[PDB]
Amino acid sequence: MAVPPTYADLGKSARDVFTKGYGFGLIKLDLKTKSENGLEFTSSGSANTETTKVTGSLETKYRWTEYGLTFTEKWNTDNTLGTEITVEDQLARGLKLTFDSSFSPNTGKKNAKIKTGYKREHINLGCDMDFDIAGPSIRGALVLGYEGWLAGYQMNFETAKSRVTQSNFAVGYKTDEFQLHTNVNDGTEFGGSIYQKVNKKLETAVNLAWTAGNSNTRFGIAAKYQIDPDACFSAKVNNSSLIGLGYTQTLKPGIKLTLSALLDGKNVNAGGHKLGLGLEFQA
Amino acid sequence: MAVPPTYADLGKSARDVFTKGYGFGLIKLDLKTKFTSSGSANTETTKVTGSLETKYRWTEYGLTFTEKWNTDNTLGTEITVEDQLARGLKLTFDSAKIKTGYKREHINLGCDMDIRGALVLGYEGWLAGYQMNFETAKSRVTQSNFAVGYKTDEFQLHTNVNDGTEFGGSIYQKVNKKLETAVNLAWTAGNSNTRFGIAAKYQIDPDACFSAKVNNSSLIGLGYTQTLKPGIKLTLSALLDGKNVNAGGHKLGLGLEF
Ligand SMILES: CCCCCCCC
Ligand SMILES: CCCCCCCC
Ligand SMILES: CCCCCCCC
Ligand SMILES: CCCCCCCC
Ligand SMILES: CCCCCC
Ligand SMILES: CCCCC
Numbered sequence: 001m002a003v004p005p006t007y008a009d010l011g012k013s014a015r016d017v018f019t020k021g022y023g024f025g026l027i028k029l030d031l032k033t034k035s036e037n038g039l040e041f042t043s044s045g046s047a048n049t050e051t052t053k054v055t056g057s058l059e060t061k062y063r064w065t066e067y068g069l070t071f072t073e074k075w076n077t078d079n080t081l082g083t084e085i086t087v088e089d090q091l092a093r094g095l096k097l098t099f100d101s102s103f104s105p106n107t108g109k110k111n112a113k114i115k116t117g118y119k120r121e122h123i124n125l126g127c128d129m130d131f132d133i134a135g136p137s138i139r140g141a142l143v144l145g146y147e148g149w150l151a152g153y154q155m156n157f158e159t160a161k162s163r164v165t166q167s168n169f170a171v172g173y174k175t176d177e178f179q180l181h182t183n184v185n186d187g188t189e190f191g192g193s194i195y196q197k198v199n200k201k202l203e204t205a206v207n208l209a210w211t212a213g214n215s216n217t218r219f220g221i222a223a224k225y226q227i228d229p230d231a232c233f234s235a236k237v238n239n240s241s242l243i244g245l246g247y248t249q250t251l252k253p254g255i256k257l258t259l260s261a262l263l264d265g266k267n268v269n270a271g272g273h274k275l276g277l278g279l280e281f282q283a
Numbered sequence: 284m285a286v287p288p289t290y291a292d293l294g295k296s297a298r299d300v301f302t303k304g305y306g307f308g309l310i311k312l313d314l315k316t317k318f319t320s321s322g323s324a325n326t327e328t329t330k331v332t333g334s335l336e337t338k339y340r341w342t343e344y345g346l347t348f349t350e351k352w353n354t355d356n357t358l359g360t361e362i363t364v365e366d367q368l369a370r371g372l373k374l375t376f377d378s379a380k381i382k383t384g385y386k387r388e389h390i391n392l393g394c395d396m397d398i399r400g401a402l403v404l405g406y407e408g409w410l411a412g413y414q415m416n417f418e419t420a421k422s423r424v425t426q427s428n429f430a431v432g433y434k435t436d437e438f439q440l441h442t443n444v445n446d447g448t449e450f451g452g453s454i455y456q457k458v459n460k461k462l463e464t465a466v467n468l469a470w471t472a473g474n475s476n477t478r479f480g481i482a483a484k485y486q487i488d489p490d491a492c493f494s495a496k497v498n499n500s501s502l503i504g505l506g507y508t509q510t511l512k513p514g515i516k517l518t519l520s521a522l523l524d525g526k527n528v529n530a531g532g533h534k535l536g537l538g539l540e541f
């Protein structure tokens with residue numbers, strides 16, 4: 001409805017046209033399993049193309065619908081363990097408390113955090129408490145919204161340094177089929193995204209980002225046209241002539257196949273082009 | 284409706300929001316007779332100038348006579364013959380310039396000779412265009428202009444690539460029966476030289492009109508047009524430089540219609 005999204009989720013539809021539906025240089029085979037209403041199992045097997053690094057993950061997710069509890073745990077072949085607990089709507093008027101934790105061998109990740117969010121008709125507030133060993137920090141999210149107009153501010157205060165290390169503003173406007181968003185980070189990093197839905201299934205997205213002094217200019221355009229109710233086709237170009245193609249097709253009620261390819265328009269002949277494959281079985 | 288415009292007229296609706304409604308640093312005295320009497324007076328050059336035009340109409344037989352005498356005593360002869368040798372075929376001998384062009388339901392053809400060649404194709408609001416300029420004295424093309432866009436009554440998008448070096452774009456929008464909004468963008472490939480600008484034309488009443496531009500160079504443009512009397516439209520304009528507010532050499536103009 002009119003509930004404003006989180007600061008990290010505004011301008012998401014334009015971002016999903018660029019990201020969703022593309023698998024580059026990866027052989028992704030996932031299997032989803034929902035045996036009961038709450039329990040969900042998901043094991044994935046990916047193989048890198050450039051480095052030939054096979055990575056297999058195992059995720060167990062259970063949902064407690066009555067008490068609002070939500071448990072999420074992830075496992076990986078690299079022993080990169082992650083756990084998340086989400087309590088939603090336990091307190092009055094749409095509250096949510098989340099406990100995240102990620103552990104990794106030798107990479108130096110022993111981080112865990114406590115997230116806190118508040119939602120209403122026009123206000124969306126977020127509070128994070130990262131416990132990184134290098135230094136704890138508090139993240140504050142504030143999003144204003146009324147009549148399709150959005151306004152957001154994000155702040156991260158690092159207690160180890162006793163100062164705010166990042167302060168991001170965001171102003172945007174969105175409709176049912178049109179979304180315009182503007183982002184400025186630390187006064188020097190700027191950005192903007194325009195989401196447009198042309199037809200019943202034609203999503204048009206334009207992304208623009210640059211730094212202070214007309215530097216690091218990066219712009220592009222993406223599209224997500226479907227030809228069939230079961231087939232999705234995606235294409236995107238940027239100023240570096242990187243052309244990304246993607247074709248998503250579900251072959252049967254529980255099988256999904258995704259073909260994708262990245263082409264370097266600068267050097268077509270041996271320019272480091274990438275092919276990707278994605279199989280998602282439903283069970 | 285379905286007929287496409289020429290290459291010089293595609294994306295004109297968004298351009299009219301920027302161009303029309305402004306007489307900067309100029310006292311343009313205009314008189315419309317149904318004939319064109321326009322007298323331009325620069326406030327900085329201080330050189331009174333006035334040009335006149337006459338047009339004889341023969342609509343039943345399909346010919347027109349045109350002759351214009353400018354201030355600096357230069358005159359140009361121009362005659363056009365259209366819809367005779369073929370439906371939509373239009374010839375023009377201006378000055379001495381020979382202009383030929385074909386206009387149909389989905390194609391706008393044009394071959395100017397003084398050579399310029401343009402072609403515009405249209406289908407369901409989608410427009411493709413390409414124009415070239417071939418210099419016979421240089422034995423090489425000097426301009427290669429390509430454009431493509433999508434046109435609708437309330438929204439118009441237009442892109443431009445001239446000589447493969449400079450890119451451009453324009454957006455037209457009509458959010459109300461009296462409010463308009465146009466966006467402009469142009470830049471050169473391989474360079475940070477960008478040119479971004481937005482304008483609007485608000486119409487308070489059928490006799491009043493207000494316009495406003497702004498540029499990334501902090502060039503603020505304002506314009507108010509009123510029709511206090513039937514047959515006399517007074518338009519006021521002022522150019523404001525945001526870079527030099529004090530002693531910046533700002534330009535204001537005044538236009539009268541009759
Ligand atoms: C419109 C808000 C201005 C943002 C200034 C940037 C300071 C971090
Ligand atoms: C609306 C587009 C703004 C472009 C900013 C200039 C990029 C260097
Ligand atoms: C319209 C896209 C052109 C990209 C060129 C920018 C780098 C020269
Ligand atoms: C909407 C595309 C704007 C690109 C500007 C690039 C300036 C170097
Ligand atoms: C009006 C309720 C919002 C409270 C923010 C601290
Ligand atoms: C909305 C708070 C801004 C702090 C810089």
Ligand SMILES: CCCCC
Nearest residue numbers: 196197198438440
């Ligand atoms: C609703 C039509 C939008 C075309 C860009």
